[PDB]
Amino acid sequence: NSFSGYLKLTDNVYIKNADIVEEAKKVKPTVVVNAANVYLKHGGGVAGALNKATNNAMQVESDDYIATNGPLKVGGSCVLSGHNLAKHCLHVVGPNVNKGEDIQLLKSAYENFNQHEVLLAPLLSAGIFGADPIHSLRVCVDTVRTNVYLAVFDKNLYDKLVSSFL
Ligand SMILES: C[C@H](C(=O)O)[C@@H](NC(=O)c1ncnc2[nH]ccc12)c1ccc(Br)cc1
C-alpha cells in the first residue's frame, strides 16, 4: 500500500489521475476493486483492463466462482484473488442506470468498501453504467469510511472532480 501522488479530498478519500493497473503493479495493495457485472464477465473498461493484466487468470477464477455460487446481486460484492495485482480483488456491482437499475444501489455498492481498511479503486457506475461521475464521487465520500485511493483514468474528468471537491 505505498501510494504516491494522491490528492487528499476528505479524511479518508484520496484521488489520482492514473491507470488502476499501473497503480496496482507499483503498490501491490491488499485490495484492488473491480467495477464488475453480476456474472463477473470482464468484457471491457476497468474489468477488462484488470483481467488483461492477470493474462485471463481473473476471468478463469471468476467463471469457477459463478459456477459454484451463482451471480452477484446489484449493490453486492465478492472477494477473489488479486493474482499479480493485489492480495485480493473486491468485485463490486454498481447499478447500470442506463438499464433501469436504481441509483440508490450506488450507496449499497460503495458500502462494500467498508469491509476493508485500505483499498485501491475506480469510480463506480461511471461511463456505460450511465451515472454522473461527479455524483458517484459524492456518494463515495458520503458512504465510504475506510481509506480509499481512487484511480481516475480520464484527465478531463479528474480535473472536473478536483474542481468540484477541493
Ligand atoms: C470514467 C472513469 C475514469 O476515467 O476514471 C472510468 N475509469 C476507467 O475506465 C479506468 N479507471 C482507472 N484505471 C483504468 N485502467 C483502464 C481503465 C481504467 C470508468 C468507467 C466505467 C466505470 Br463502471 C467505472 C469507471
Swiss-Prot record:
Quaternary structure (record): May form homohexamers. Interacts with N protein.
Shown stretch of the complete protein: 1026 to 1191 of 7096
Organism: Severe acute respiratory syndrome coronavirus 2
Domain Macro positions: 1-166
Function of the molecule: Responsible for the cleavages located at the N-terminus of the replicase polyprotein. Participates together with nsp4 in the assembly of virally-induced cytoplasmic double-membrane vesicles necessary for viral replication. Antagonizes innate immune induction of type I interferon by blocking the phosphorylation, dimerization and subsequent nuclear translocation of host IRF3. Also prevents host NF-kappa-B signaling. In addition, PL-PRO possesses a deubiquitinating/deISGylating activity and processes both 'Lys-48'- and 'Lys-63'-linked polyubiquitin chains from cellular substrates.
Regulation: Inhibited in vitro by GRL-0617.
Protein location: Host endoplasmic reticulum membrane
Mutagenesis / variant outcome for changing S163L: In strain: Gamma/P.1
Origin organism lineage: Viruses, Riboviria, Orthornavirae, Pisuviricota, Pisoniviricetes
Substrates-to-products reaction catalysed: Thiol-dependent hydrolysis of ester, thioester, amide, peptide and isopeptide bonds formed by the C-terminal Gly of ubiquitin (a 76-residue protein attached to proteins as an intracellular targeting signal)
Membrane topology: Multi-pass membrane protein
Protein name (Swiss-Prot/TrEMBL): Papain-like protease nsp3
